[model samples]
Target: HMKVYLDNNATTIVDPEVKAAMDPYFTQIYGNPNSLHDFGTECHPALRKAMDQMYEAIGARDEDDIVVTSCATESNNWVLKGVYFDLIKNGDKDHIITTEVEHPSVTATCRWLEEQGVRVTYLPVNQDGVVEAHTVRDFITDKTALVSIMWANNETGAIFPVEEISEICKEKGVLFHTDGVQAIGKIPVDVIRAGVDFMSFSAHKFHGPKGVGGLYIRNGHPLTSLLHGGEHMGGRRSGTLNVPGIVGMGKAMELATYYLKFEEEHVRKLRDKLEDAILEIPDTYSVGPRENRTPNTILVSVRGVEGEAMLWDLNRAGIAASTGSACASEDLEANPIMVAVGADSELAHTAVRLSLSRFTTEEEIDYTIEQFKKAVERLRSISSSY
Candidate 1:
């Protein structure tokens, strides 16, 4: 296992403070949140605090505006599938619009929708991996039901003009949603500013426990529930709550509020340092636009070297990195974001992704730069296939 990890975008290490907060729920105080006695009472307060902390972190107007889900994947499905079915019931709308570089949770779901006779418009991107609001609005028709776009890309970290897109959707009276899994912790996310009807995020992305995330639904937005059973969450989301995960996630979001004040204080500077040093290598280029990128993410390609080969070399050096979105890395195909950005096949195959966090140090960044250069050089020298 690598001691220094640069794959924070995939998931972060559980914070020790959050773990301590969750300890009672796992061991001694474990209780069914549905129970009517003291057992349920013990878990009730932690659950409320979790909801409040998440609302605060995302700048939601009301605590009731959110629903807890297993992860961003489930939250995203609830909006895409749930909203689609709800609107289709009226026979008034049957079209959906989204970008080319969205997480597979959205793109893959859209594909499944296409088979069911639903129209899906996959908006295009330029070399910067951006979808202009004008292009999106032009695709809108009377039949368009929802527009789903990611706030920050899982791979290249390129940010879309969501506030602008939201305004366009509002003028057309179309519902809008954003997969905010990557943006919530790394950038300023205000559902009010963006004007999105629905927003989804995951706790594990921000140093919280896995298997707990939230979906924010604006008041009056109609959405069918994905789960059809118990009403533990805001009288809509089903299933008994995960008390320990919720408590830890709440503390993690509370900690995010503190880190947001001083985020670029250390991580941004160190990230820039890593980028500058790595670009010195031969035949390498960055994947996305420089100006509108997340502060902690860097996607780059070293020509004549397979990204997986480089990952192996770096892993042996006790450092961790990835080819692209951790969810998509298991596949043998090229990264979809790279393909959408118009990177040629060679560069697409060579692309690698590295992400940092507030916990990253200057020393780790320095070591990464040193080891990255060595790995690329070694890979190029050894691999005749490249």
Candidate 2:
């Protein structure tokens, strides 16, 4: 049986184009990028070219502004940790601001910082799962060090107004960071245009290989290194470079930029079709700001049925979906993101996310919708006796 994957937000299959782009780095050009020998010099050009491609694709004004890391998680950690350390060491600031709906990396990191005696303000979102620019502005004070918000929510796909928030932070002279892991390829993002001090993106979210991601630090930003060792990534992050992964990420960004318009429309249509079909089912509701969400994600809750049960049935039917952010799913409790969006406990537990991608087809969408409808109907029917 053919499988229809609707969990693109959790992870996507590595694109064949990206694989083809990376094949040479593993066998032929493999070398420590820091070495001055011929092998290293040979690999250096490919790495620089890849960086240039990524920088152009993301609309950065300069290639030096981009810093490659192991993944978005590392990038997120780097931003939070780097900023916190800088403020503490310099005795310049004490307060940090973020939203309650951020991915666990940001929220949890903030919480950890709180334990370390750093003051953090978690601004709550309205029912739409979006924190207002005003909320961020209100939280800013002379001691506020950084304002970090997600570009697009991983669970509900509700996009925050980062552009406006960044402007607010700029006016207040506070650093602004955004976890752009979900927004980079699915939407247009120009760090210069957004006026963000820092932005983080993961390669796997855009059909590139896993284990490689990037951070954008605005020129002249006083950010300390997250990892210290060889001067790789200009000392921002340290590790032997994953040359193939970096090449694949750059190639993926290049393709995404070229195909963005067509891909966005196609995925949006597929997501809308999925939402339409799911909404037709009894006692179901779409979560978050429907109009402002990522074109690829749909979050729906089927009342009186458990999300995991529905997920299991869909998996049996060769349809893949997710309960929430994959990182937060290990805990059976209702997710904090759901709670932040004003979902009740029952609805939160019943919520499932369906995320489309550039490669998703109409046939796959139809198959997944049909199977989902059937599964919800069956589950509700069985639960009626309880």
- Estimate, for each residue in 168-196, the C-alpha lDDT of model 1 and write its tens digit: 99999999999989986788888889889
User: Which lDDT values do the candidates have, in the order given?
Assistant: 0.82, 0.82
Candidate 2 residue spans exceeding 4 A from truth: 325-348, 384-386
The candidate 1 region of ten consecutive residues with least summed lDDT is 325-334
Error of 2 at 301 (Å): 0.7
Q: Mind giving the per-residue lDDT tens digits that candidate 2 earns over 34-65? A: 78888887777778889988888878876347
Q: After best superposition, candidate 2 residue 65: deviation in angstroms?
A: 1.2
lDDT of 1 at 32: 88
| Clash pairs, model 1 backbone | none
